[PDB]
A paper describes a structure:
SulE, an esterase, which detoxifies a variety of sulfonylurea herbicides through de-esterification, provides an attractive approach to remove environmental sulfonylurea herbicides and develop herbicide-tolerant crops.
To elucidate the catalytic mechanism of SulE, we solved the crystal structures of wild-type SulE in complex with CA, mutant S209A in complex with MM, and mutant S209A/H333A in complex with MM, SM, TM, TrM, EM, BM, and CE in the range of 1.29–1.63 Å. Upon binding to SulE, the seven substrates adopted a similar conformation with a bend at the sulfonyl group, making the aromatic ring and heterocycle nearly perpendicular to each other. The aromatic ring is trapped in the pocket and packed by Arg150 and Ala234 from both sides. The hydrophilic sulfonyl group is close to the hydrophilic area of the pocket and forms hydrogen bonds with one or both Arg150 and Tyr45. In the six structures of S209A/H333A bound to MM, EM, TrM, CE, SM, and BM, the ester O atom is hydrogen-bonded with the main chain nitrogen atoms of Gly78 and Ala210, forming an oxyanion hole. Superimposition of S209A/H333A-MM and P44R/S209A/H333A-MM complex structures revealed an outward movement of the lid loop from the active pocket. As compared with the MM bound to the S209A/H333A, the phenyl ring moiety of MM is located in a similar position, while the sulfonylurea bridge and heterocycle moiety undergo about 90° rotation, and the heterocycle occupied the position of Tyr45 side chain in apo structure.
Residue numbers in the entry:
A (entry chain B), B (entry chain A): 12 to 360
The structure:
Amino acid sequence: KRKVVLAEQGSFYIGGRTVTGPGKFDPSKPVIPYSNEGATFYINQMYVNFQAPVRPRGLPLVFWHGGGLTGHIWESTPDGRPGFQTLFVQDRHTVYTIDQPGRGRGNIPTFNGPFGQLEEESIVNTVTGNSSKEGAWVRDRLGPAPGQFFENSQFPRGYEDNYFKEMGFSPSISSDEIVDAVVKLVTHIGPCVLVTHAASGVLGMRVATHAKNVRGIVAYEPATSIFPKGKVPEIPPLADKKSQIFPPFEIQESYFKKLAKIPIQFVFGDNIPKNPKSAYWFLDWWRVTRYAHSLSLEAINKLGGQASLLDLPTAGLRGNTAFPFTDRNNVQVASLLSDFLGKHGLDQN
Amino acid sequence: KRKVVLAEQGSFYIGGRTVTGPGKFDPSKPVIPYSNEGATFYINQMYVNFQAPVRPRGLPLVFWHGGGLTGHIWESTPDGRPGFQTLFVQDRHTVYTIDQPGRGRGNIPTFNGPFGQLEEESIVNTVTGNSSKEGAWVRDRLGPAPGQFFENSQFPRGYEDNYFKEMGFSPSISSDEIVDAVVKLVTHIGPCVLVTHAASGVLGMRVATHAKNVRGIVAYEPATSIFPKGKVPEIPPLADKKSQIFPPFEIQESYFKKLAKIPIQFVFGDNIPKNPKSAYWFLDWWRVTRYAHSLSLEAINKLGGQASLLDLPTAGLRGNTAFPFTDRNNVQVASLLSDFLGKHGLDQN
Ligand SMILES: COC(=O)c1ccccc1S(=O)(=O)NC(=O)Nc1nc(C)nc(OC)n1
Ligand SMILES: COC(=O)c1ccccc1S(=O)(=O)NC(=O)Nc1nc(C)nc(OC)n1
Ligand SMILES: COC(=O)c1ccccc1S(=O)(=O)NC(=O)Nc1nc(C)nc(OC)n1
């Protein structure tokens, strides 16, 4: 199970832009402490890793981590089992894993001065946000409250420290620039499949509307819904009568219709409630967010699309968290992804 | 040259601690926007990647990136040629690559509030520092001034953007906590060899004094010298008669002596002046820094050690930058590393 044979592997940077400080750089002056004077800074670039099997079959897969994560989540599970990178190289796909701008080996744009500030220009905000262990516990549906596990959980229990250590903050890089970096990657690699997760769900949908090389999307637990501009359906508030899900992203209809041209599958784990759950904010949030996604997929299908929602429990898999690709049954989750790729010929040359 | 057969690969997090916000966490209350209330945050953990060959020989190698870098520099060169990770898995060594705390997939400790601040506790500074392209150009001795190459350069010209894109800031995590994470990794791995670079040179020396499992060190272009406490020799200022090199790190003699028990090699590239060069601050800085390191190695040898300085031009390799392991002749640089490992019995089981 662990052996893997690579025809080649590597990593590279792509995308981003440059910003400049004032003045001129004098090489005879002390270079350290570092100065903005005469400075050119590369910002908002993305890190990309690839592993290619011998004699690949079908399209390369681009695995895109969720919010506050990195490509680590596709490399290994918290308890050290093979991640989807290894499983799909073994399945004879070339596999790209990214650290998007602002995360991991992607660029964090900061300079000499308060965080994110280049002289008088605010590239990203100095004030950050970041989930706690407790927030992530309920966000990812390990259980209804920190320390608790749902019955039949597939979380790798005992490896909580490993799991939460993989998570961190994201600077306020614009989503436009994150999407731009991945569009450039898709141009670089050719026809490919995007496999997204939570926060990258809506970003991957956006990439597909700008990049015809995206030939399919599988989105694990996408966090933000997407609709044609002015056609967002009625979406109820949460059971606490006061909160709402994330404002759906709206794109022009001519771009939205590009989503009807490729196979798209949204995948959800277990323990999303059917009924309002006022006592558990993030469980109720997932209920209404999944509902909004069902309407988004229906809108894609009314325009001639091939969009579907897979609830893992209906496929016979019980207990998955919001990271099904690192849960204890991730091999079975991978099998369902192989099934999708095979159904649409994305595993053939 | 590109193929690699892995018995296993993966990644994991190790080291770090936790800090806590005030108050308690209520799962019924809105979890987003994220709050410090009731929060546990994992901070200062390190990312570790490993690739293991079939039938490994000798000790595992731990590759430790320089300042503002990540394990990318061991994966691939800026122009896409195999890095030392691939070369030494092919040489039948298990290879670990790290993103140290505060870099890449390592943790950047920030919360909900101004960067690095947890309520009124400053975990890392809000004001950052970061090299420009211009500062890094002369730091790494691509040439004497930005945009200019030494005639003999081994840099992969044309891939400047790719190269500079791999560099970024480091938050003010204490060096103690960075050393702590790698000591914990070395305890987990068992006997190994540290391969360090620039800023991680002094940190690897410190790790060796705390971890008998470190059985050898090869340091490329180390940036800070180390001496026994109270025994720093006379080191001249730079040619501008105002600047100094980095204040040498001082450790108790009992720990310093541990450096005499293992083979240690410092490796320097080309274009470091023999004579004072006041027009080019970083060239002169490298002259005096290399001199300080020569005295450091001499001090280890006077304690019965086996500490050597390898200037790559004396081995027939001309024009290397301060990243010899990603230069155009990196295969030849690797050969010299294999020779060190072999001579010292580190390539046998
Ligand atoms: C892995 O888990 C998630 O990925 C994840 C999963 C579920 C919800 C949220 C996230 S997230 O933390 O990244 N945030 C996100 O998708 N975007 C977003 N949108 C708005 C409008 N506000 C905020 O506030 C943070 N975030
Ligand atoms: C994921 O499920 C829970 O999280 C969960 C849910 C409810 C209770 C307990 C757990 S548990 O997992 O902590 N522990 C558990 O189940 N213990 C247990 N021990 C014995 C000795 N026998 C039996 O059952 C016969 N159960
Ligand atoms: C890849 O290049 C290097 O590794 C590298 C190479 C040569 C010099 C500097 C660096 S560095 O930028 O990271 N900084 C470093 O080693 N430590 C350090 N120590 C002091 C006392 N001040 C500062 O200020 C920056 N830094």
